[PDB]
């Protein structure tokens, strides 16, 4: 027939894009950053006052 | 990608793993006939046959798309009873499809389409008209036969006339043979130490028997559940697989490759591609999901199936004798060649309409089939 | 992307484990005529009666399964208005249900496995005091967490976090 | 090291790289540090349908 050199083609820019995920709960959650220096000398713990009764 | 925890990751760095999928091509589809010169005095049959050829080729393309989708669709939604048995079972059935697509974290950005067969579409319409005809939706389901064009979370709900019938599987008591693990690999070594690409889709399973199994059979394994494809959280739905090919009396190829989370033989970047909770055990039972002969419903994400086509260079100068033109296939958006050639000895001519294409299921995990009334 | 999904999974697990307000039903969400709304409304009412502060808003998160069953409740109804027909055409059950500000489905909610504890009784007549700190061993005042309480029982067999 | 932004959530991490001259190989690390805390467990609820046993 036509015996010639073969190639293998990879369409690199054509990704398949298999996964889609959503993050509702962490979006709705509060985000707190205490001072870092004080956090280190604690066990990474901050105490928060509760509303008084 | 995988993740570690904590500090001090020394000697725990991973590698990079890039999986890949191949799309190939089929055999050319032809319409080919011959006529003697005495049959060309009246050419009406000739022209009508050419037009019939165009129509048949187009509908063959459509049939191939439908059959590939139904055979390769891993996502199996089943229901032990027919559509119409209950007040929202058609909506329930489409919503089951949508919910499994969502929980699996499959990509649906290009859109989602749900294809009913005419019978199940009529049963959905029946469900709608059994309510009070007050309302735009029941009024359209009554005056017309149409359920709404968007149902549950699906962006396109249609009625497909060519959806195949899934004949019931006769396999009974099928079990795995020995523990089998399947590893995500980009390539592998053959002889001569060449790196050869590996298709990520399929996996070969050794079973106790493959007697009543066929292409398109929907199966599951006892205790094997799906995972959220990123969060890797165990789902309530048993992992479903479709049979691609029965290659032996004890080997079957299934279109989603089962990568287990608990497999200790996987690297972290291999385990990052896990889709089932546990691996295939030795004597673990095989569940047969097409238990009753039924006509199928197909749903996908829109990019899952593609048609790949190639030109047929019959208009080259190397084909001087035969007369070739371009043949337009009406609806499916494909182009073929129309060639004619006559023989002086027999005073007869040949007519060949050739079309070359190939249907490819790039994401068989994003293609699903719905089987209602699967009882006993 | 994986790191984002991991933090989400952790948030879901902590919220499910730490939930004090428990709304249980004998039956599933798809069985009765308006029991998904009743389920959300029970949550809202226990929040209201206890006089909890919710100025920052309230949020309800369903299973994909339970969200589907709430949609089924909205769809199995004979009369189609804006809400039932949106539950038919979309999956949505409205962003506001009962008194909740936001209602939506979360894929990464966990499973709560049943406990095999049976016949557990309280060993002694125990009372708990609101304390900011307590003395220990050395006589140091160490802060007390206002949330948790340790209770002696007859047995903890079958009990888990 | 550079700052690494995690999508869709209010979290930032670090992106670190380091080279090795003997092997001509590098190392890449993305570290994210956080903690999930339920400050008002009395204001968190769980719904448990179908508890019939």
Swiss-Prot record, chain C:
Effect of residue 138 to A: Lethal. Complete loss of procapsids assembly, assembles as tubes instead
Effect of residue 133 to A: Cold-sensitive phenotype probably due to an assembly defect
A Gene Ontology cellular-component term: T=7 icosahedral viral capsid
Subcellular location(s) of the protein: Virion
Position of the signal peptide: none
Effect noted on mutating residue 136 to A: Lethal. Complete loss of procapsids assembly
GO molecular function: identical protein binding
Keywords per UniProt: Capsid protein, Late protein, T=7 icosahedral capsid protein, Virion
One GO process term, biological-process aspect: viral procapsid maturation
Primary location group: virion
Lineage top rank: taxon: Viruses
Family: Belongs to the P22 phage major capsid protein family.
Subunit structure: Interacts (via N-terminus) with the capsid assembly scaffolding protein (via C-terminus); capsid proteins and scaffolding proteins form building blocks that assemble to form the procapsid. Interacts with the portal protein.
Domain notes for this protein: The insertion domain (I domain) plays an important role in the folding of the capsid protein by acting as an intramolecular chaperone.
Function: Self-assembles to form an icosahedral capsid with a T=7 symmetry.
Name listed for the protein in its UniProt record: Major capsid protein
Encoding gene, per UniProt annotation: 5
Residues of the full protein shown: 109 to 269 of 430
